[PDB]
Amino acid sequence: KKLFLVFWWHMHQPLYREPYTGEYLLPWTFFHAVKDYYDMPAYLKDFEIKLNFNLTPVLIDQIQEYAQGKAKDVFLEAIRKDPDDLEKEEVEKLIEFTKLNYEKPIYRFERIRELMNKEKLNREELLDLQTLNLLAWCGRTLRKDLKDLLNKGRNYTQEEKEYVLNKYFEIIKKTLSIYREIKEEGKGSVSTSPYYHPLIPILLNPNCVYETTPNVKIPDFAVSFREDASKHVELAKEKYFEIFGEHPVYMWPPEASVSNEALELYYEKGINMLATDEVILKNSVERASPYLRYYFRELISVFFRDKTLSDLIGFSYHAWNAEDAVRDFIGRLKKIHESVDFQPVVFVVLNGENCWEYYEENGIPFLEKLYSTLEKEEWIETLTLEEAMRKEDVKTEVIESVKAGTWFDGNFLKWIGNKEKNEYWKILIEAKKKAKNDYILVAEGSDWFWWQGEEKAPFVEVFDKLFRSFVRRAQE
Ligand SMILES: OC[C@H]1O[C@@H]2O[C@H]3[C@H](O)[C@@H](O)[C@@H](O[C@H]4[C@H](O)[C@@H](O)[C@@H](O[C@H]5[C@H](O)[C@@H](O)[C@@H](O[C@H]6[C@H](O)[C@@H](O)[C@@H](O[C@H]7[C@H](O)[C@@H](O)[C@@H](O[C@H]8[C@H](O)[C@@H](O)[C@@H](O[C@H]9[C@H](O)[C@@H](O)[C@@H](O[C@H]1[C@H](O)[C@H]2O)O[C@@H]9CO)O[C@@H]8CO)O[C@@H]7CO)O[C@@H]6CO)O[C@@H]5CO)O[C@@H]4CO)O[C@@H]3CO
């Protein structure tokens, strides 16, 4: 009697490439590529477990552009430059970027503390601010190759900074190839999402927000987004086919977001399985074990992720010592294993790249001990998505209806409902009426709506500039 464990790491970045300049206005795709996007599947080179990944098509596009040397990244060019060439604006952005990340364990260099406490910074000190910002984002693989430069911690030279940059781009050039390798070797399944990570239930039917939050106020949806919803799925199938040579049969719905109508659309588009959140299941069915494989109207398979286990990794364990975290996690799986007489299916689903910067040493002690301990347990079998979908010694249930929602509280409040978020929607609506190209799809990305209506942060105006730029480009 086994416990079936399914990791599904979700990887996504909105499009940071401003369409009129062609400049990546924020370096987050670059930094999560050198840190997480190659390195998370690369664990499968050293650990005999199965791990699954979701890659949004918008993120693949950007990875492709950095790998080909075509991405113009404004923050990165400030890193690359000799400090005597830096503009005041670039020094300010570099300082600003440092203090935004200052308290994260991956930024714990004593030299950073010194530089931050300083007045003007000289050339040698600016070189250390440049290179320490680079090295802070170093992934598992290169933390070994560059071990001597990391321990240096100070007094970097331009030639060392450039050495680091070269190795970083070699990692990006390797990144799509390793997803294809782990997929081919049977070590994991790779899924994708609708192209630009939109909220499909809202695009299909904005009134679905009233299934959970009846008092919410939303704008006048005077145009249809239903065919755009199909295009996000269709175009995602094409990009996935280009990269992996098949149409995708698994998708991760952005924000775990599902509705009756979105489930039908995914079925119509050839998706045979997805996952969503335990809160959705609880809202939808009285009798709700998340350890079953569900079938929505016998049309499509649906797993409901284990919220607590997913939140332990994403919310709790950054604050723990790795050993104590791993023993806690294994203990919890053991109680699940002992809590049922059948073989449960346990889906651990979260973002694969955002929680590790808050762990000591980028979560590497945690994940290396987690994966090493998992591969030791005879009563745990980790599954690819393909295996979880076809596994026969698993218990099963049909579900006929779901209450539309997301994995944020089971509702849509974080993307629609207040004055500022609603304004983005009205802008989108008006613009959809005048749209002439696919940049309107870019503007339908969830991320724009998330950041709006709650600014208060360093760099959030960049997301607003991107959204409005895409909205403007869509009408030309
Ligand atoms: O759009 C850009 C980003 O896109 C991508 O993200 C999307 C995901 O892909 C998508 O799946 C989804 O994510 C959901 C997520 O998976 C769920 O976990 C949840 O989010 C919760 C989160 O995980 C929790 O941490 C918690 O957050 C609280 C936190 O606990 C608390 O400490 C505090 O946060 C402060 C931080 O501690 C501090 O770091 C800082 O935050 C800064 C940040 O440091 C800084 O770097 C910058 O963030 C960058 C980010 O680093 C970049 O990588 C890039 O992000 C993209 C992701 O990489 C994608 O995967 O751009 C960001 C913006 O520049 O700026 C931050 C500003 O604050 O200060 C923090 C201020 O809070 O508070 C929080 C809140 O309680 O709970 C979260 C839920 O509230 O739900 C997600 C949405 O459903 O959506 C992603 C966004 O679109």
TrEMBL record:
Transmembrane segments: none annotated. It comes from the Bacteria. Residues 6-397 form the Glycoside hydrolase family 57 N-terminal domain. Gene3D superfamilies: Glycoside hydrolase 38, N terminal domain. Signal peptide: none annotated. Keywords: Carbohydrate metabolism. This is Glycoside hydrolase family 57 N-terminal domain-containing protein. It comes from Aquifex aeolicus (strain VF5). The lineage of its organism: Bacteria, Pseudomonadati, Aquificota, Aquificia, Aquificales.
